[PDB]
Structure formats: structure tokens, C-alpha cells
Design a protein around this ligand. Structure first.
Ligand SMILES: NC(=O)c1ccc[n+]([C@@H]2O[C@H](COP(=O)([O-])OP(=O)(O)OC[C@H]3O[C@@H](n4cnc5c(N)ncnc54)[C@H](O)[C@@H]3O)[C@@H](O)[C@H]2O)c1
Length: 180
């Protein structure tokens, strides 16, 4: 029942960036509700102070596979090329990583209105999501899986790479909700 030591992140950017530079949050907006609903992420205001991760590798696999299928749909509709490259990073969590569900409830119990606050089961409420505040340093990033789909031939190829900058130390995610 301890907080996870290992989390995963789907991202489009390659290890030549991420293994050396880590992940940096979009900006300084630490509103937990705006992050978890996506409003402060890339498709919204692109200013979230959080880097999203999941303790469930399967979650990031569904994400990668969905983006890959959306690429392939873009060609059956005639506005795309087929090819897709995605990455799943394996990351060591530390005290700057906070449970999304715990942080969400802390926020809405204190500042929220009614919606999705009382009727909010465990599977439904950002289950296994973890928010890294501000940065995931490169020393926390252990390895990456690259998945390449060739949209012309249909071939998919999966490869793995280790980060020489990874530092192995005993850390786990924060047991407490995030608070500003
Ligand atoms: N990514 C995951 O594995 C993951 C894990 C758990 C939850 N989520 C949830 O999924 C939703 C989408 O999350 P996300 O993590 O994909 O959003 P995001 O805005 O952090 O990343 C989406 C894309 O934006 C780009 N990007 C991100 N930060 C960047 C920066 N600082 N500079 C340049 N480009 C950058 C990358 O292309 C990235 O793939 C969120 O609501 C989140 O809570 C995602």
C-alpha cells in the first residue's frame, strides 16, 4: 500500500531531449483541478505546473496505442501519412510526485462546487495518476520504450533504451496530497 516508487509517462518527445533534460512543466499554473481536466495542458492553456505520470504502465500503453490508432485513422480519412513514433518513459518517483486522486479531493473539498465531488469512486477518479510538480529531473528517468508504426507497410517496432544519467536511490511518491 506504500506510494509507488515507479511511474510511467507517455510523451511524444525523444530521449535525446528527455534523458538529458528531464521533463519541465508547461508553466506556473498549479491549479490541480485545471490540470486533471486537461484545461492547463497542451490542448488547453499550456501552463500547468505538473508533469503527468501513472503508476499503471497499462494506462500509458493505452495512451500510446490510442495516439497510434488516431494517426492511422487520419490516413483512412486521407489527411495523414500513417507513421507514428511514441515513447513511454519509466520514472522513479520522489516526494515531488503527488497522487492525483488525493490531490483532486483535497482541492475540491476545500474550493470546489458539487460536481464530481461526492459521487466519485476510486476507478473513476484519476485512479493511478501521479503529478510531478515543476520538473521530473533527468536523474529520475530510468528508461524509455519507443514504439514506431510504419503506416505504409503496417509494421510496428518496439525498442528500449536506458538512461546513463539515471541515479538509483531510495525514493517514492509523496504520501500526502499536493497543496499550494
Ligand atoms: N502523459 C501521461 O502518461 C499521462 C499520465 C497520467 C495522466 N495523464 C493525463 O492525461 C492528460 C494529458 O496529459 P499529458 O501528460 O499528455 O499532457 P502534456 O500537456 O503534459 O503533454 C502533451 C504533449 O505536450 C508536449 N509537451 C508537454 N510538455 C511540454 C513542454 N513543457 N514543452 C514542450 N512540449 C511539451 C508533448 O508533446 C506531450 O506529448 C492530462 O489531463 C493528464 O492528467 C497523462
Amino acid at each position: 500500500g506504500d506510494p509507488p516508487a515507479t511511474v510511467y509517462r507517455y510523451d511524444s518527445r525523444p530521449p535525446e531531449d528527455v534523458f538529458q533534460n528531464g521533463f519541465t512543466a508547461w508553466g506556473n499554473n498549479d491549479n490541480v483541478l485545471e490540470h486533471l481536466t486537461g484545461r492547463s495542458c497542451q490542448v488547453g492553456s499550456s501552463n500547468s505546473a505538473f508533469v503527468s505520470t501513472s503508476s499503471s504502465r497499462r494506462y500509458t500503453e493505452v495512451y500510446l496505442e490510442h495516439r497510434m490508432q488516431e494517426a492511422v485513422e487520419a490516413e483512412r480519412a486521407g489527411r495523414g501519412t500513417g507513421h507514428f513514433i511514441g515513447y513511454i518513459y519509466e520514472v522513479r518517483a520522489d516526494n515531488n510526485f503527488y497522487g492525483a486522486a488525493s490531490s483532486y479531493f483535497e482541492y475540491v473539498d476545500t474550493y470546489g462546487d458539487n460536481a464530481g465531488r461526492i459521487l466519485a469512486g476510486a476507478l473513476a477518479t484519476y485512479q493511478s495518476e501521479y503529478l510531478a510538480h515543476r520538473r521530473i529531473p533527468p536523474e529520475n528517468i530510468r528508461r524509455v520504450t519507443r514504439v514506431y508504426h510504419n503506416g505504409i507497410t503496417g509494421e510496428t517496432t518496439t525498442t528500449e533504451y536506458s538512461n546513463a544519467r539515471y541515479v538509483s536511490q531510495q525514493t517514492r511518491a509523496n504520501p500526502n496530497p499536493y497543496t499550494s
